Amino acid sequence: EYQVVTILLVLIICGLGIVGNIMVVLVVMRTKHMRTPTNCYLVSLAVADLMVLVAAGLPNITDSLYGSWVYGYVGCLCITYLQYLGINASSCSITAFTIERYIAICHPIKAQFLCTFSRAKKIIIFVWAFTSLYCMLWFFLLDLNISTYKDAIVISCGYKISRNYYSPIYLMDFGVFYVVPMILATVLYGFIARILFLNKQVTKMLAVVVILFALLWMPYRTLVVVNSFLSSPFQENWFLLFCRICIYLNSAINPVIYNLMSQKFRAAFRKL
Amino acid sequence: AEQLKNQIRDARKACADATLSQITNNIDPVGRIQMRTRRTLRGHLAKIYAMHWGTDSRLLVSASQDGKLIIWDSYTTNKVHAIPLRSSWVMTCAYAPSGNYVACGGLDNICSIYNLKTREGNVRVSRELAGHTGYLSCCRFLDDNQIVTSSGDTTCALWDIETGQQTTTFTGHTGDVMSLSLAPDTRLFVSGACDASAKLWDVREGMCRQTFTGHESDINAICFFPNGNAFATGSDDATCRLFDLRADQELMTYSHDNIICGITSVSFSKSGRLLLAGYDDFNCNVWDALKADRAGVLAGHDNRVSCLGVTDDGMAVATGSWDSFLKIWN
Amino acid sequence: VQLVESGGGLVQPGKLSCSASGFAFSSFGMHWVRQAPEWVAYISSGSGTIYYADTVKGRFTISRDDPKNTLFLQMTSLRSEDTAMYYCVRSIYYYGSSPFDFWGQGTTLTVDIVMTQATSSVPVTPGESVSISCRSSKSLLHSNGNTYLYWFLQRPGQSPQLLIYRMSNLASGVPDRFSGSGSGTAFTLTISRLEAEDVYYCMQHLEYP
Amino acid sequence: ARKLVEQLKMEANIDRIKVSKAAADLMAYCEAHAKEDPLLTPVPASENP
Amino acid sequence: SAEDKAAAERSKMIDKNLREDGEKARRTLRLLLLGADNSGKSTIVKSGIFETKFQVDKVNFHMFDVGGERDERRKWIQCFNDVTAIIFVVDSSDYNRLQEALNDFKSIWNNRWLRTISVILFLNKQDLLAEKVLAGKSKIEDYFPEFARYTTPEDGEDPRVTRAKYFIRKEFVDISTASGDGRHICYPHFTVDTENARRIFNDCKDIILQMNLREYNL
């Protein structure tokens, strides 16, 4: 049927990132380098792209055939806190990597003295604490409900309060995790292009990152944010499954866009 | 004197009855043993060049590129002293048998000697031994008033800390002398030179008693067997070998047939059946000195390992490396 | 090489300054042992550890000072138990170090684990190989195996010294006629071949008062 | 040249025994200390810190 | 026990007095000054290891002229492999002091320990070679045998010496670009005048940037 084929479209692109992010950590944590800050700024993304695939890619595989929260209440607090944590840490350890990447290129003589492995831990333990402070806030506004009109008393893992009253959690995650990595990677990658035009074969791959991380987070962050304003929330299967098949597709290319297109990771992988 | 050098090659290497592998064929080996990182003596912040185990087997110095000499406690991972160096390009360090003196030597052709147990509580330099014309590659301690010193101008000295000048000078090398080690019977020492030769000198006489050859590249690691009747070298051509003083040949060749990175440091055990060896492939090795096998691997470093030593009782093995992490194994 | 204290204030009950002129006293502990006719503190260098006395523990303060090496106490509710001579000690610990290797002056201000042996009236005669033995209760084969033992030398002079630290070993500046042997929870100290200028004290170090 | 030949007789006129007993006494030191070696035989935790 | 709870408070103060002395040896870009033989190595910027220092626009440089036993470089060169740039000064006037530098440049470049360090190749005494072609002796064709077929593109002015000074510079970068692999590349210059204290800071910013292109995965 329709949803029988999308039990594969969800579970193979949440599987190629669930093998691609394991391909990150076995390259980082089992090589004999000095653990450079870019080896540390990506494991902060390789354990945040796991939780939106191994804890968000398959409450869709085990619930496409049921329609209710199969995990009940022991999951719909403890697994949906790990769905809003693989979102706000796989898009907030991006704007902490872009700022470390622009400072290292457009100010390289002022960034051999700041960027250190002891300083990459200072931000990543910070940026995981400051987003665990935000995803645990969901707990007091998250509980499932039951609907008795579809085929039986069946509904899945929804919202405890009315949907229109769930507005400002969805905009302070919009304006911090979508418009900041789409503006501070548009400005701070054109600055690399102005530097690389004064002395330029990699500036096309750098122009992919600005588009690919603003067109794959575009439909989810505009459909969730419009249901805070719509009197009747959008609920069809042909569009909601598409607006979060790109969320899994964004976190399956982060071991490819940020990692595999490098020069030193490929030689590090070739020795292991 | 071209034909006279062939008289040594027929009297030192042709007098061999057998090899060493035919002796250790029927010997039950250690087979497979494994050390483990008990301690991790972090705190340095540059490449580490030398360490030396103290006499009480619970103290060790470490010399690093950042210009610091640091005495450690090997039990509680405890730093004892911080000795700031004059010239930060240090390539060697030393520990006295009394435990009262340490001594470094660097690129500045100068051997400083520090006194640990002063009455003012600090650590201050006792006698700064200037008088070499090249970089100082190794330095040792016979007693609290005698120090032998290799350097980077083919000259090994033999100082006297009270007076200050060389009482003896061991000339007779071509390149540099990169490392040296005193014997347990402390009236003899050996020196591994940068011209692929190893010279057995003599403290009391003053002339070099023997000269050993065989390495292709330059010897940067030497240490005595604890009986004082043998010693094992290590050069940059990725091969170690153990000679002998009463036979003047190469009895045991500790060649790893699948590695290409050069040996940086070598020290025997406290019993003479664990040849530790610090290589350039970012990790150490363990060689059973009897049967010439790879009985263990101390893979715990990420850059090259430059210094390595075994205590007097046999308690531990501390290996330092270029990633500023010195690690005690057991 | 040198160390000095200052004071001896006679006042009604209810500040004696040291000065380590010629030392590295930014790398020394700073005790004050009483031995009235038994500590006060262990202000370590890098002042994050200030123990205090068994008699008060909340007053009779003592304030660290690094640059001019101004180790003093603070006169805060002085009692009749601290009416003693405080010997500031150039003791600092590392494996090989000798606590009480140097010692200050007996400034003489006239304001737990039991190792009890007073014997406070013993005349002396030379020649005989005498042997004092202060033993203690618990087994001093410690978790680190280093006995915090009890034999500290003194003299009829106005300042103490050390004979037998950790029940065996000799200090710096004292003669070598003193000696000793021991075992678990015991010590047999052999002070032999006596001579002129030879009181004597035995106190613990295991825990702060 | 003129000093090397005199400095070569000090390393040429010495007696050299065979390598068999030179390695047999190498093993004779090895057998006597193969018990008091805390790294050769992994002795238990009675004295290893 | 008050002993090892104080012999470890000592170890936490010898800990905090290396990470305040290790944040000062990481703020200066070290260099490695290396002339050939009286080639003006001391006249470019202006104990037994002559360490000269200079700063330009708040960036401290430390150059390490090693006046050791000889120019063997067999073992003291590996102590400088954590460095930003070697500096190879060579006087361009003589012709016995250029073909000796060609033998002294394939030893530094084709090496093992300097394989991530790029040479800021200085050229000095070119106003004693332009003042040695108006003299008309000019044995560049006699000393260098394959000199006579060399054009002079992309350049007082004289095309005879412009073809000459571009010949040795293309001879300098010939042994450079053979095996450089993009990690490290030469940076030749032209000059004994004071306009080169900026020409190193302007060049080390393209040495760090060629590392951070490979470091931060760009």
Numbering used by the authors:
A (entry chain A): 23 to 221, 262 to 334
B (entry chain C): 11 to 340
C (entry chain D): 2 to 15, 19 to 41, 46 to 119, 125 to 211, 214 to 224
D (entry chain F): 12 to 60
E (entry chain B): 6 to 51, 67 to 175, 181 to 216, 219 to 245
Sentences from the paper on this structure:
Thyrotropin-releasing hormone (TRH) is a tripeptide (l-pyroglutamyl–l-histidinyl–l-prolinamide) that is widely distributed in the brain and spinal cord, playing dual roles as both an endocrine hormone and a neuropeptide. TRH activates the class A G protein-coupled receptor (GPCR) thyrotropin-releasing hormone receptor (TRHR), leading to the coupling of Gαq/G11 and the subsequent production of inositol-1,4,5-triphosphate and the release of intracellular Ca2+ ions. The cryo-EM structures of the TRHR–Gq complex bound with TRH and TAL were determined at resolutions of 3.19 Å and 3.26 Å, respectively. The overall structures of the TRH–TRHR–Gq and TAL–TRHR–Gq complexes have high similarity, with a root mean square deviation (RMSD) value of 0.66 Å for the main chain Cα atoms.
One such analogue, taltirelin (TAL, (1-methyl-(S)-4,5-dihydroorotyl)–l-histidinyl–l-prolinamide), exhibited improved CNS activity and much better pharmacological properties. TAL exhibited lower TRHR potency but higher downstream signal transmission efficacy than TRH, which is consistent with previous functional studies. In the agonist-binding pocket of the TAL–TRHR–Gq complex, the distance between N2896.58 and the carbonyl at position 6 of the heterocyclohexane of TAL is 3.8 Å, which is longer than the distance between N2896.58 and the carbonyl of the lactamized glutamate of TRH (2.6 Å), resulting in a much reduced interaction. Moreover, a slight difference in the orientation of the histidine imidazole ring of TAL versus TRH was observed, resulting in a weakened interaction of TAL with Q1053.32 and Y1063.33 in TM3. The change in histidine orientation in TAL also disrupts the interaction between TAL and Y1925.39 (the distance between TAL and Y1925.39 is more than 4 Å). Comparison of the space-filling models and cross-sectional views of TRH–TRHR–Gq and TAL–TRHR–Gq shows that the binding pocket of TAL is wider than that of TRH. First, the phenol side chain of Y2826.51 in TRHR was observed to interact with both the backbone carbonyl oxygen and the C-terminal carbonyl oxygen of the third residue (amidated proline) in TAL, while it only interacts with the backbone carbonyl oxygen of the amidated proline in TRH. The indole side chain of W2796.48 in the conserved rotamer toggle switch motif is deflected, making the intracellular end of the TM6 helix of TRHR move further outward upon binding of TAL versus TRH. Second, the hydrogen bond between Y3107.43 and the C-terminal-NH2 of the amidated proline in TAL results in a conformational change in the conserved NPxxY motif at the cytosolic end of TM7. Moreover, structural comparison of TAL-bound TRHR with TRH-bound TRHR suggested that the deflection of the rotamer toggle switch at TM6 and the side chain reorientations in the NPxxY motif at the cytosolic end of TM7 might be responsible for the higher efficacy of TAL versus TRH.
